[PDB]
């Protein structure tokens, strides 16, 4: 259940 | 939330063309000049044989890793696209899950040489025979045919920038909560792309762009072939495929 998209989106 | 979620004027559409082309230039992954220059660096018969002797699982792992790297640049392109960060997180994820691979497939035509039917992979150009160990020859052939058809359009970098922004901002993706916001953003990006084509006397490509069903079919075949590979080597996918790749193509 990998969830990387939310991390990439939230990282600024 | 964003000017492009409502009606935009001609001056605002001109500003949108510049903005999209800038977001693309900053996230294009490899420069076009760098890809063109390397066209003369082609894998030898011995090197092709070496790739064909690699195991199916090691080739699948290498291709998934390189695709994941390309997808990461598409995620960054989306983050820099006007309006995208103003959509809700549910919608950002819906659009990236459905469209990231489609954008990568479009961008890939830049790395495809129609003169000898080769693609840039791991430092040199190789034909579809380079990937024979994957055991998904129909999918590879379909990707090469698609790349060949886009290559015949002679896309400029600015045309790829505007066309890929539209591939991503598709208000028809199932699961979008703010569908009207996405429709208005898509309408403005469509005007930006068509304005640029009009200004550059390139409107003849509009009837020549592939149908949406074509990118959908390539994405469906990719997921189907991955499911077949996963049934054969489940622990390879679980232990050695990138987590982002699995989130997009194998439900986690
Ligand atoms: C897409 C953005 S761009 O044009 O800047 C750009 C093109 C090609 C590469 C190479 C880099 C590389 O090789 N780094 C080690 C690249 O990623 N090439 C590749 C990867 C994957 C495939 C396939 O899975 C499929 F299916 F996408 F074509 C394949 F053929 F192996 F099955 C093809 C080419 C990088 C960047
Ligand atoms: Na090309």
| Structure letter (DSSP) for residue B42 | B
Q: Find tokens 């997009």 and name the residue.
A: B248
HSE-CB for B30 with a 13 A CA cutoff: 22
Size of interface A-B (CB pairs under 8 A): 30
Classify each residue of A1-12 as buried b or exposed e, where b means 16 or more C-beta atoms within 10 Å of its C-beta.
Answer: eeebbeeebeee
Alpha-carbon distance of B7 to B78, in angstroms, equals: 21
Residue B158 in contact with residue B73, Cβ under 8 Å?
Answer: no
Whole-angstrom Cα distance, residue B41 to residue B5? 46
DSSP percent split of chain A into helix, strand, coil, nearest 5 = 50, 0, 50
Structure-token pair, residue B65: 């890793």
* Cα gap B140→B142, rounded to integer Å: 5
Nearest to B100 by CA among B78, B126, B128: B78
- Ligand 1 centroid – CA B10 distance (Å): 37
Tokens of B118: 């080769």
What gap in Å lies between CA B81 and CA B164, rounded to an integer?
A: 11
**Is the Cα torsion angle B93, B61, B220, B81 positive or negative in sign?**
positive
The H or E element spanning position B124 is strand B124-126
Distance (Å) from the C-alpha of residue B129 to the closest C-alpha of chain A? 33
Distances in Å between the Cα of B13 and the Cα atoms of B161, B189, B232 are 15, 8, 50
Under 8 Å between Cβ of B188 and B4: yes
Which token pair is B99? 């469209």
Sheet of B118-121, strands arranged across: B112-113, B118-121, B124-126
Documented resolution in Å = 2.0
Report how far residue B95's alpha carbon sits from residue B113's, in angstroms, rounded to the nearest whole number.
29
Pocket test for ligand 1, best of B99, B119, B123, B245 (most atoms within 8 A of CB): B119
Task: Report the chain B residue with the minimal C-alpha distance to residue A9.
Answer: B79
The neighbourhood of ligand 2, an ion, using CB within 5 A, equals B 109, 112, 151
- Using alpha carbons, list the distances in angstroms from residue B122 to B34, B63, B130, B226: 14, 10, 11, 21
Spatial CB neighbours of B77, under 8 Å, sequence gap ≥ 6:
B23, B24, B27, B103, B164, B168
- Listed in sequence order, the DSSP H helices in B88-128 are 89-107
CA distance linking residue B61 with residue B48, whole number of Å: 18
Residues whose CB is less than 8 angstroms from the CB of residue B247 and which lie 6 or more positions away in sequence, other chains included: A2, A3, A4, A5, B97
- From which experimental method does this structure derive? X-ray
Q: Which ligand is nearest to the CA of B117?
A: 2
CB atoms within 10 A of CB B13: 19
Question: Which tokens is B199 given?
Answer: 């200004």
Cβ atoms < 10 Å from Cβ of B168: 22
Domain layout of chain B by residue ranges: 1-252
């Amino acid at each position: 259940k990998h969830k990387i998209l939310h991390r990439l989106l939230q990282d600024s | 939330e964003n000017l492009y979620f409502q009606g935009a004027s001609l001056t605002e559409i001109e500003h949108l063309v510049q903005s999209v082309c800038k977001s693309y230039r900053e996230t294009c992954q490899l420069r076009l000049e760098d890809l063109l220059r390397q066209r003369s660096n082609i894998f030898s018969r011995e090197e092709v044989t070496g790739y064909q002797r690699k195991s199916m699982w090691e080739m699948w792992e290498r291709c998934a890793h390189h695709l994941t790297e390309a997808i990461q640049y598409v995620v960054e392109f989306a983050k820099r696209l006007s309006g995208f960060m103003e959509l809700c997180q549910n919608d950002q994820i819906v659009l990236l899950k459905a469209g990231a691979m489609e954008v990568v497939l479009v961008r890939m035509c830049r790395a495809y040489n129609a003169d000898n039917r080769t693609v840039f992979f791991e430092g040199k150009y190789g034909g579809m025979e380079l990937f024979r160990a994957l055991g998904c020859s129909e999918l590879i052939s379909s990707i090469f045919d698609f790349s060949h058809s886009l290559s015949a359009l002679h896309f400029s970098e600015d045309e790829i920038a505007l066309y890929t922004a539209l591939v991503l901002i598709n208000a028809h993706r199932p699961g979008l909560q703010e569908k009207r916001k996405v429709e208005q953003l898509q309408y403005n990006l469509e005007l930006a792309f068509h304005h640029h084509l009009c200004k550059t006397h390139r409107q003849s490509i509009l009837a020549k762009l592939p149908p949406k069903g074509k990118l959908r079919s390539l994405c469906s075949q990719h997921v189907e072939r991955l499911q077949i590979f996963q049934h054969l080597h489940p622990i390879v996918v679980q232990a050695a495929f990138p987590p982002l790749y699995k989130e997009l193509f194998s439900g986690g």
